[PDB]
Design a binder for this molecule. Structure first.
Ligand SMILES: Nc1ncnc2c1ncn2[C@@H]1O[C@H](COP(=O)(O)OP(=O)(O)OC[C@H]2O[C@@H](O)[C@H](O)[C@@H]2O)[C@@H](O)[C@H]1O
Ligand SMILES: Nc1ncnc2c1ncn2[C@@H]1O[C@H](COP(=O)(O)OP(=O)(O)OC[C@H]2O[C@@H](O)[C@H](O)[C@@H]2O)[C@@H](O)[C@H]1O
Ligand SMILES: Nc1ncnc2c1ncn2[C@@H]1O[C@H](COP(=O)(O)OP(=O)(O)OC[C@H]2O[C@@H](O)[C@H](O)[C@@H]2O)[C@@H](O)[C@H]1O
Ligand SMILES: Nc1ncnc2c1ncn2[C@@H]1O[C@H](COP(=O)(O)OP(=O)(O)OC[C@H]2O[C@@H](O)[C@H](O)[C@@H]2O)[C@@H](O)[C@H]1O
Ligand SMILES: O=C([O-])CC(=O)C(=O)O
Lengths: 311, 311, 311, 303
């Protein structure tokens, strides 16, 4: 018998709710939206409101809200958005201690009810939180993935598209490294209809676009005043969920476990990835200049510093 | 030159923001999201977050947030979601009069910059607020429309689909009048696969579905705590916008100005409508039973009552 | 590991190819397009032409053209469009017996390589050809299905839409039995925005729409000069395939095996069905008037009559 | 009032019909399918068939078949697929006859041309129309990049979504691909596929149209060409400002003028908003020079 895919979204706040609604609209599977017992009723309210949209938008989906992880049993994909979010002036690194505990508590319940699932993590700081989920899970590395690069290249592409007055569809970006201020946007691997951006955009304006990408999460935090971005992070999660569920073998930046690639091991890092029905099918190694190699090395040091703060 | 449709959404809260994001993903036009000066930055945050999703979801649309109505100039369609969140223990009169003042202020600036726009109104109470928008615009009646019935039919279809374990695609509801006590459903014009629902669902369970539809807004409030539905309301506005922008000539329940239809004149009422490129193309006049006529007379009496609260 | 659905389409003519292309652009699965050994190369050309559209239209799907049923192994769904048109100087008896022979040979190869698949049959006459697939497969009845009523309701809806100048989305048709004189339309369960059509269209013009639906296949045959309709038949097959692959539990008219429904057994007949992940989830039994029962009894004699033409 | 876009497709053969069905499914506007008086009824049949699918696929569009150009009045876009040395001279006369009726009923329309050889036929459509260069476009590069992307995706076992190609000039020997400006997820293909396999993919791309012809035995490709037309139509109707290869009128770009050539383009609401000029190596300028010579050769066969 033909059975729907099942996606559990852990954390039913801004990012989780926005993710859930996109997953159901795209009919990518049944959705279980999970929060803490104190936010059970709000979570069910969000889930029923989304389901009540299904006849207008013309989609078939089950959406439920729960505080009971038994409702996540046999999920194909579990998306983790559970944790504390930042306010203006905070680094993503300021959340490590609270979020690590949430990741350990969440992973333990997820692997109990869905021992065969793929896990995609948003929770900040995401390199260190995806690492925590990996180790707690006991899963092989292909099955635990972080989102950062899709969102960072998305922001990059938006600003480039505004600069050149072209469709975002024909702009390509390339971000490696941690999801931090030390991100390594590779302008050399960045194009407008395949044309190197360095040939199209003067260095000063291109440098400003690279800096605006680095500070992109902060820009949304400062505008909102009382939370962080959710539309583009949710979109970024859905693209990664869709690559796996439909076995698309996309080349996408994702937070992956390294065992030698770029000359690093035992860390999660933002790298180029093949993403398919088996999760991360492989980490792609670019040939880097010594300047890019150095920029990446600073990124890895930030990651390891954050990992030293884990219990 | 071919130019995009332009949609302004007035009020950048949960419903306005959710509507803007759906409109952009469907590439129905460029979106201008408007709120009060005090929320200029949050509104610009939401709009820029949505645009940053565009390279990932693969849509071409411009989204800006603003507090300057000059940014709304030459909108084809304006959606009004502006209104105050009812104060704990505020009188219905003070609500009507506070929201009436907002519709008057909003409508003045909208018609100044967009003299040819179609306006769709969500603001509660939608009958009296659409009436307020109509009289202040001095637009013809075909161009000033309220949302109500589409949201009630959506909830009705969800509940019927749950009862019968079938797709929402193959359920239809039929509602005249507004929300709650003011709703006039025709179960006799309500079907699963074109089969009367009275032949498929026992009377006690069908009456319970009709009641649950009446109370359906309050059901989401009670689950959320401090808030009201936005996913299904947003979907409802988008279906009505889409019907006009693509000249689809849908049959949809809408809040329309009457001039003799059903016996009534000088009022806005939830009635079946052909909705297309000239907005309300006509009000459809059913033959109603004596019971139905008297349920509608009582609904119209509730509508006259709210109109007497206006200044 | 997540794996794409696999759909084999048997017969790479107008309907089969049109069907394969729609299935691919919807990313419903990988498509295997099968024809006779003599048409191997044109079938590969069609498949590769479709595949070369994938980067432009933006779908991830494999499409291959073959004469080797080994390529159909582990198909979730098989769509049988294989068949021969009535050649000038051929009896109807010979036409039926030729198509029966094709159904026997195709089914034997299909079930050898896909013992767990659902089968959807287009080949006319669909009632007798579906029965042949059913008897040959050894499959339970829920897994062997014919297309007929979806295509008839589609033409009916198109004609009503034109008559009323409204969206086809808001029109519904209801038909039991087959095409032509075998069609049993229930205009009383056919609506525009849930309004019975008998109230909106005078009887003469409405009877003319019913008769044009009966003749609908013939109208396209007579307009083309060579061959029969393929766009609407392909779309009808795609709606039924999607209902099963996505477990939609649609209510759709289907050619279903009866074991007592409507007072008939051991035949395939056009009936309302719930269509989902287990295939036909049930046949829906309506209360019919004496007029409707008499009309459906003539349709049943026509089915039994073609079954008597089978070897 | 809000009113649908109107698209006329001239030639209701395999490519015209396939284009029309895609345009209506995507709700890009009303479709008018046009052919010769002798095929009026088959044309109405295909159009009615496509319309009868609309309730099932859930799209709202009008689709009509005709041999009367009066029905194409006020078309926002007109796609020309009508056609069949002597090849040039016959198809040229089809273009002049078509353009004359098209500009008569739709003087303000954008025109996209498929008819082979599309360089000369787009030139003929341009001169006859008297339209500015921005309103008369040929399809070629999108089709060639689609085949290339398909071959590369197969070679690397990855999504066609993350493969890009870059072709100047026309089909076959006339095709000037820039493998250096072709990538998988932004990675240069020269670092992913060895030269022998990449050369074979470039050669398959050149022969790609011939490969479908040989496999079919009784016509040429229609699915990928129709998709190539729809993407260019969509860039214009929805003012997307896509960068796409297109057959465009040159007034100095790449050092050439008074010809149509396959060049990178910004495609939006005003049709071709600009011809993009990039720095070519000396090998690529030489190849483009050879390609342009071949376009001048076919342009001399025109009456
Ligand atoms: N142990 C837990 N189990 C389940 N849900 C939890 C748990 N702890 C917290 N949550 C829930 O996680 C949700 C987080 O949502 P928001 O506070 O709205 O934050 P959001 O914007 O979604 O960001 C979530 C996360 O992703 C990053 O972008 C951000 O920095 C943060 O780490 C809240 O609803 C909260 O109750
Ligand atoms: N004069 C005004 N101009 C513009 N925006 C305004 C104005 N007055 C209020 N607003 C804005 O309207 C928005 C209303 O959003 P929410 O309070 O979040 O309510 P929402 O869920 O969006 O529902 C919109 C409206 O529809 C009805 O359900 C109800 O009447 C509600 O106010 C707020 O962001 C508020 O700042
Ligand atoms: N044994 C077989 N196995 C596989 N394919 C076969 C076989 N016998 C014939 N076919 C193929 O079936 C295809 C039928 O295509 P068309 O003749 O173009 O007919 P189409 O418009 O697709 O209609 C398909 C069929 O369904 C009904 O409408 C009608 O009964 C018609 O035969 C042809 O390509 C034919 O070679
Ligand atoms: N003057 C004309 N006006 C309109 N239509 C015409 C005219 N002359 C011919 N046609 C029609 O053009 C159609 C061409 O369709 P096909 O022969 O099937 O060719 P197709 O596969 O659609 O390719 C169309 C064209 O594009 C190029 O690939 C190549 O030049 C080919 O001729 C036919 O229906 C033919 O009757
Ligand atoms: O910055 C944040 O806090 C959330 C996030 O990860 C992002 O938006 O980049």
């Amino acid at each position: 018998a033909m059975k729907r895919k099942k996606i559990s979204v852990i954390g039913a706040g801004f990012t989780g709710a926005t993710t859930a609604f996109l997953l159901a609209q795209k009919e990518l599977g049944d959705v279980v939206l999970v929060d803490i017992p104190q936010l059970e009723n709000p979570t069910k309210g969000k889930a029923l409101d989304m389901l009540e949209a299904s006849p207008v938008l013309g989609f078939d989906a089950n959406i439920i809200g729960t505080s009971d992880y038994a409702d996540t049993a046999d999920s194909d994909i579990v998306v983790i958005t559970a944790g504390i979010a930042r306010k203006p002036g905070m680094s993503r690194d300021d959340l490590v201690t609270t979020n690590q505990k949430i990741m350990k508590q969440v992973t333990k319940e997820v692997v109990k009810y869905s021992p065969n699932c793929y896990i995609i993590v948003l929770t900040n700081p995401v390199d260190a939180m995806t690492y925590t989920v990996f180790k707690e899970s006991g899963f092989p590395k292909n099955r635990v993935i972080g989102q950062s690069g899709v969102l960072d290249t998305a922001r990059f592409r938006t600003f480039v598209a505004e600069e050149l007055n072209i469709s975002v569809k024909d702009v390509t970006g390339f971000v490696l490294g941690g999801h931090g201020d030390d991100m390594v946007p590779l302008v050399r691997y960045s194009y407008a209809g395949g044309i190197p951006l360095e040939k199209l955009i003067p260095k000063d304006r291109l440098d400003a676009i690279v800096e605006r990408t680095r500070k992109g999460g902060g820009e949304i935090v400062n505008l909102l005043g009382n939370g962080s971005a959710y539309y583009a992070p949710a979109a970024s999660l859905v693209e990664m969920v869709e690559a796996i569920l439909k076995d698309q073998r996309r080349i996408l930046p994702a937070i992956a476990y390294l065992e030698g690639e770029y000359g690093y091991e035992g860390i999660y890092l933002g790298v180029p990835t093949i993403l398919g029905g088996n999760g991360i099918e492989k980490v792609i190694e670019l040939e880097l200049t010594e300047e890019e190699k150095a920029a990446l090395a600073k990124s890895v040091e930030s990651v390891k510093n954050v990992m030293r703060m884990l219990e």
